Design a protein around this motif. Structure first.
Motif, PDB file in Angstrom:
ATOM      1  N   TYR B 374       0.803  -1.210   0.000  1.00 41.45           N
ATOM      2  CA  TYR B 374       0.000   0.000   0.000  1.00 41.45           C
ATOM      3  C   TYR B 374       0.841   1.266   0.000  1.00 41.45           C
ATOM      4  O   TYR B 374       1.944   1.383   0.534  1.00 41.45           O
ATOM      5  N   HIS B 423     -11.543  -5.223   3.548  1.00 39.19           N
ATOM      6  CA  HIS B 423     -10.800  -4.608   4.644  1.00 39.19           C
ATOM      7  C   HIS B 423     -11.286  -3.175   4.805  1.00 39.19           C
ATOM      8  O   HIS B 423     -12.050  -2.662   3.982  1.00 39.19           O
ATOM      9  N   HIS B 425      -9.669   0.926   5.925  1.00 37.87           N
ATOM     10  CA  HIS B 425      -8.529   1.790   6.219  1.00 37.87           C
ATOM     11  C   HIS B 425      -9.067   2.900   7.107  1.00 37.87           C
ATOM     12  O   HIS B 425      -9.812   3.754   6.621  1.00 37.87           O
ATOM     13  N   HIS B 584     -13.321  -0.949   2.110  1.00 40.15           N
ATOM     14  CA  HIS B 584     -12.861  -1.308   0.768  1.00 40.15           C
ATOM     15  C   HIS B 584     -13.317  -2.725   0.428  1.00 40.15           C
ATOM     16  O   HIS B 584     -12.824  -3.703   1.002  1.00 40.15           O
TER      17      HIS B 584
END
Ligand SMILES: [Cu+2]
Ligand SMILES: [Cu+2]
Ligand code: NA
Ligand code: NA
Lengths: 620, 620
Positions: B374, B423, B425, B584
């Motif tokens: 990332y 997931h 963030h 996401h």
């Protein structure tokens, strides 16, 4: 050559002549709306037929008419007489604005109210506002405007700084009678000026800003052909203009390899309403339907190079009709340019040693309109990665009132004795979808939380669910930001390389919808604004969420009537209507001229492409 | 001169010398964190005393230490031995990442697992990831990393395209012991490559993009003095850099006439967590605390002119310590520039005849970090009108897995056999507020709907309510998008000219917060992420929402323990902690390299000024 070309001055002149010879455009007649009709559904439509729809007002009191004309063949196709007590009044005419102030200036009740306040009638401006439908039985079938007064101390003074509270008048603009003058009491007229170009208010102008120069030494990356056909970075679309809706985008498609793939057939802002939340009888009727009642396209600004639009700018100058059928050009009314949009994609990989950066860009199509005290910018953006975004920019001068001694629960104080009533600005985007063709469906996507237990022993799992909307009666949806709710428009008959239906995801800002009581007049007339998302089956005549004739219509027209047909929308030609808006509690910083605030929505591909569509962007 | 200046290479070398002289930095010691301490509360205070906080690791297994040193006086101020099984392990060292792949390459269980899959150990990369706290009792008090495998077909291959699912190993990086190798079964390794610079995948590069040239012929409008003090269009601030937090903004103030008015004392992203939602035992432990465990400033990119930052760019090159106490410069690690930002205010007035347009601009301060697959961009924006905004940009390569044959509720398919687990963030912004000084309070503002009836006869009124948060125990708040919920930070002792307390309003994006089950390990360790807003009383040692030592630390530190003190926050020195994040569900378009997606927040003045603060902007 294209059926989606902008109307030309010659076309409008021919429409005028056709109406004239047919006896439909005498001296008592006024054109309240004139616009080109889109081609009817037909993936093989061959014959050129440019048709115009016209709303004809009669100033002598005769019934208005809706007329359809073919400019190609020079004929009147249909002419219907309208019963306005039933189907609504025609849009407000620009020439009716002056009439309100002139009629009140000779009315004894108005003059006596001004005399009690020691106001010179020659200095009192009257804002002419739409009437709505309330308790006054005498207004049914009559063309009514309501007037609120503001004092202009001198010709270049900002009258918005000096509202005359406690006073409202109602006016029949056809018979030219003042029907009511309501005086609820004397409020001090706020005395401070709001002249934002007066050096005594601005102070010395800053000398600290150095120029930013944005140039394109080789010219822009987009092409314009046929007057209004755009090609830019795999995108293809036509830029239309309608006097009611403003900029309309047609035939939005994306070139994916050798295939031109449709995404949206027609995109527009089909209504916008500004409801006021002050319960004072002076203003509790106040609701602007800027699109439906006033027509936002006819007040579009001419945009100045270097000030309104900065960079290498391509202008369009749309043509509309004036009230007598003469063509009127809006010089430099639409700005088109591309702009840098930061980083598109970036990765520095430890294992491969490759460092990769690409920059993003967007194409901007914009216009600005001014309706009385407010100014609105409408911006459409196309991005390299397939994202489509709309943004509304609200600025101008806030609508003012007195600030009552002892305060208010519904009005902000901006300056001594000067208030600004609470209000909303709510838009309806009409998206005639065509994701890879016309067979589309909508799914609602919610995040799904999962409980710790068998199959989820560490309590970390989460998921999502999609619900297909199959009929119109279940296609009236509300936002839910807490569950991450979005809506996906997919084509069940067009699959990507993973055998999944291609789609686009609508991301809303999840702002509050209409706050008025569900039993109110405004909730009935602006029913679209009570819910975030509506889906209808396409029909040629279902154009606006509020109906064709919004002015003084009693309620229920538009979306609630369309939805009641309960048609199949699962894999059909469908239209998405998205409500979004700003809730404005005015702040001191909004005065005396408001810095821009924004609201919008966007659509992103969701398995539309077989991989990222921007792998072929060069490093530059 | 300034106590907020960036750390210099000389200061870092002096810290090294002081630690060496004191016997704290022998050959077996490693610096896991080194950063400058902010001055304590007290204007002026100790003239000049630059103090540094150091976390010292011992590679022989002895207890680590936390040390504070004064570089000005050349002294160790304090040195405490840490009991890591209680208070948490130190952040991961860069040199420990390499250890994992090397150790596994000689372990018979690992080699047997790769042989079963016909994989050459020389082509298998191991992603070394933080361990968290789960059911493995032998990990308490040990430094553990967990490894997931990816195949690299050739040295420039993107290994992320080829995950080796069904396999995970746990490694003690101090003892150099492989504690466990877990093999749940052979999955096919996805065979398609993900090489986004391979012409076979990109196709021919576009030739259609014409250049956009952005220049400032007279240079930029901001000045930099003392190395990191910025003055720009009435704003004043200091740009700090910390190896854990990255860019930190100090002393944000606005020059209003003759007075410098504080707004924010310190602004930073104080934690960021990336929790994965796949319940497979191969990945159900996976949660990155990029800030607390890895230190995002350590991995800042050098930004290239014309690619990462476009325009007239001013760079800062911050200095950090390596693991031995030597200074390391991150060349061009921070970009600063101003950007045109469209229309600021606009109005064309029918009554006055005045047409008025002004343009907006923003100051941009940014850096980019890369942690494995990332890449994250951190952007702070200052606008002419007093708005402050933060934006995170997420890009890079998504973390991959196998896609199971029968589908998955927790993984997206990106390519044949290639999956991407769901997931989030999630970021925590720590805003040490100073609205016109340090006496501040927070109010929660909701829209209030009103029922039609007496005093609201037309059912149009709406209002708002503000609730003061008076004690820490009531200052843990949730978003409510449907009611337009925002938070106002005001100063009850500083009033504007209307006798109202000055304030700033925090506008959240209202994205979902942490989705994991409340009983999970990650919900306990990332408790901050379960609520949108927290308010604490300022305290020098309450720096991070997760506490000082996040790596392998159970719950018990951070925001839940701070707010238990239940301190007065009504007109006090307070700190706002705002959680915001992206959820996401990867799409096909995110592969093989992800186009940027964004999330953030903004603060707008709310009666901070006595009128619009941009009346003195010139027309240009
Ligand atoms: Cu407004
Ligand atoms: Cu992600
Ligand atoms: Na459609
Ligand atoms: Na504070």
């Amino acid at each position: 050559a294209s059926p989606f070309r902008l109307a030309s001055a010659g076309e409008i002149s021919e429409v005028q002549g056709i109406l004239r010879t047919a006896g439909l455009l005498g001296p008592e007649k006024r054109i309240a709306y004139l616009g080109v009709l889109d081609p009817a559904r037909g993936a093989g439509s061959e014959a050129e037929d440019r048709r115009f729809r016209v709303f004809i007002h009669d100033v002598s009191g005769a019934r208005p008419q809706e007329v359809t004309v073919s400019v190609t063949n020079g004929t009147v196709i249909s002419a219907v007489e309208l019963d306005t007590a039933a189907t609504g009044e025609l849009p407000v005419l620009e020439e009716e604005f002056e009439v309100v102030e002139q009629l009140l200036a000779t009315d004894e009740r108005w003059l006596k109210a001004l005399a009690a306040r020691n106001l010179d009638v020659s200095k009192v401006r009257v804002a002419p506002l739409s009437a709505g439908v309330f308790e006054y039985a005498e207004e049914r079938g009559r063309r009514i405007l309501r007037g609120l007064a503001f004092v202009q101390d001198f010709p270049e003074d900002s009258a918005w700084a000096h509202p005359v509270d406690g006073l409202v008048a109602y006016v029949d603009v056809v018979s030219k009678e003042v029907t009511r003058v309501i005086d609820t009491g004397v409020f001090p007229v706020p005395a401070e000026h709001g002249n934002y170009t007066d050096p005594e208010l601005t102070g010395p102008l800053r000398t600290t800003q150095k120029p930013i120069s944005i140039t394109q030494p080789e010219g822009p990356s987009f092409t314009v052909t046929g007057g209004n056909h755009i090609e830019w970075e795999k995108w293809s679309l036509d830029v239309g203009f309608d006097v009611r809706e403003g900029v309309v985008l047609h035939n939005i498609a994306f070139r994916d390899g050798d295939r031109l793939r449709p995404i949206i057939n027609r995109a527009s802002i089909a209504e916008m309403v500004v409801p006021y939340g002050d319960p004072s009888p002076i203003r509790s009727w106040q609701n602007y339907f800027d699109t439906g009642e006033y027509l936002v396209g006819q007040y579009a600004n001419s945009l100045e190079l270097g000030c309104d639009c900065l960079g290498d700018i391509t202008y369009l100058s749309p043509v509309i009709s004036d009230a007598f059928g003469n063509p009127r050009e809006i010089r430099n009314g639409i700005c088109m340019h591309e702009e840098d949009w930061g980083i598109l994609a970036k990765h520095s990989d430890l294992w491969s040693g490759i460092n990769y950066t690409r920059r993003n860009r967007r194409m901007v199509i914009s216009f600005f309109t001014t309706i009385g005290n407010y100014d609105y910018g409408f911006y459409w953006y196309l991005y390299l990665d397939g994202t489509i975004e709309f943004e509304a920019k609200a600025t101008g001068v806030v609508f003012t009132s007195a600030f009552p001694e002892g305060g208010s629960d519904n009005i902000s104080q901006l300056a001594p004795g000067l208030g600004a009533p609470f209000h909303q600005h709510i838009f309806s985007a009409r998206l005639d979808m065509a994701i890879d063709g016309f067979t589309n469906r909508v799914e609602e996507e919610d995040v799904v939380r999962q409980t710790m237990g068998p199959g989820n022993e560490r309590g970390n799992a989460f998921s999502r669910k999609r619900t297909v909307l199959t009929r119109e009666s279940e296609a009236v949806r509300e936002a839910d930001a807490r569950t991450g709710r979005t809506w996906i428009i997919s084509n069940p008959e067009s699959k990507n390389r993973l055998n999944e239906p291609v789609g686009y995801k609508l991301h809303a800002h999840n702002q509050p919808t209409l706050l008025a009581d569900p039993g109110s007049s405004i909730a009935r007339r602006a029913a679209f604004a009570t819910k975030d998302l509506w889906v209808t089956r396409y029909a040629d005549d279902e154009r606006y969420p509020t109906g064709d004739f919004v002015n003084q219509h009693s309620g229920g027209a538009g979306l609630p009537s369309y939805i009641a047909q309960d048609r199949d929308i699962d894999g059909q030609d469908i239209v998405v209507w998205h409500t979004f808006g700003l809730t404005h509690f005015p702040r001191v910083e909004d005065w005396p001229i408001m810095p821009v605030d924004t609201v919008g929505f966007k659509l992103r591909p969701e398995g539309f492409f077989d991989r990222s569509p921007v792998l072929d962007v060069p490093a530059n």
